[PDB]
Write an enzyme that holds these catalytic residues in place. Sequence first.
Site, short mmCIF file in Angstrom:
data_model
loop_
_atom_site.label_atom_id
_atom_site.label_comp_id
_atom_site.label_asym_id
_atom_site.label_seq_id
_atom_site.Cartn_x
_atom_site.Cartn_y
_atom_site.Cartn_z
N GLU A 36 29.88 43.72 42.72
CA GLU A 36 28.54 43.24 42.41
C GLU A 36 28.02 42.26 43.45
O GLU A 36 27.74 41.10 43.14
CB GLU A 36 28.49 42.61 41.01
CG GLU A 36 28.59 43.61 39.88
CD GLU A 36 28.36 42.99 38.52
OE1 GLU A 36 27.87 41.84 38.47
OE2 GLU A 36 28.66 43.64 37.50
N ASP A 149 36.22 46.03 38.83
CA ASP A 149 35.68 46.00 37.48
C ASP A 149 35.58 47.43 36.95
O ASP A 149 34.69 48.18 37.33
CB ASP A 149 34.30 45.33 37.50
CG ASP A 149 33.60 45.40 36.16
OD1 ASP A 149 34.25 45.75 35.15
OD2 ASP A 149 32.39 45.08 36.11
N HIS A 247 32.50 36.83 35.48
CA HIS A 247 33.86 37.35 35.60
C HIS A 247 34.75 36.27 36.20
O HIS A 247 34.28 35.39 36.91
CB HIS A 247 33.89 38.59 36.50
CG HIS A 247 33.20 39.79 35.92
ND1 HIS A 247 33.89 40.81 35.29
CD2 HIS A 247 31.90 40.14 35.89
CE1 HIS A 247 33.03 41.73 34.89
NE2 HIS A 247 31.82 41.35 35.25
#
Length: 256
Positions: A36, A149, A247
Amino acid sequence: MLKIISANVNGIRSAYKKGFYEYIAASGADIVCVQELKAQEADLSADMKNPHGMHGHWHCAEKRGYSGVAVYSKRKPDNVQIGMGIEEFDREGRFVRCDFGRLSVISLYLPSGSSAEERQQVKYRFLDAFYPMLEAMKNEGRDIVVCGDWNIAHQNIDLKNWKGNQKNSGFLPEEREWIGKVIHKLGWTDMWRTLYPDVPGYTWWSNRGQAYAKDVGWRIDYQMVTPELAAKAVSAHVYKDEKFSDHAPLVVEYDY
DNA sequence: GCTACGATCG
DNA sequence: CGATCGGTAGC
């Protein structure tokens, strides 16, 4: 010792303002896989491409401020693969691979299906197309670590509210079953779960309510490892001394 | 504004 | 149990 970190930074530009750049060095990590980026190459500073003189290779999405993954490493890789080789998903910049001799490390951002039914379908397509890639890599017989992820919790122990999330993207029967196949059928090792059978080890917490404060989280960030290298793992931890994202970084040390 | 990504409570 | 009750990053 070989220290590999997997961290979804929830926007690399945002994380770099929270102290993630300093963490890269202070962690003493050899390889750091980030997900991300929420940025394209033009938006990345030199320090976001090659932090602390580390080599770096990224794959950005075609849409701005969306997805994107990267792999940083002290050592120079002898080969780099940007993307899965499937346009449908490479448009979204979700896969990077770097080869270091007998070792290969991947940064992966598996699609979420929580936004809409159509994105759940796209997610299942991604599972279909990525599974054979995991089988192939497994058959390579070489040491491989797929960090990232995965957007799927495997078992009840992998999230606080398993009872109430069985109908929610991330903990659907089909998804859990898919992870189970990757582990047992293909033979990949869920590094954290094998190292610490009983420890939940959540790596993500929703923005809703006081999830983080109450530790109502999910373990959806993994380091899936091949057998030989898995047996060489010595320890792991979910870094929470600092917070750079929704996260938390997953750190694993291997006796190479 | 937009896109994109389930904890809480009745 | 089902109904409702979304904070954040970057555009």
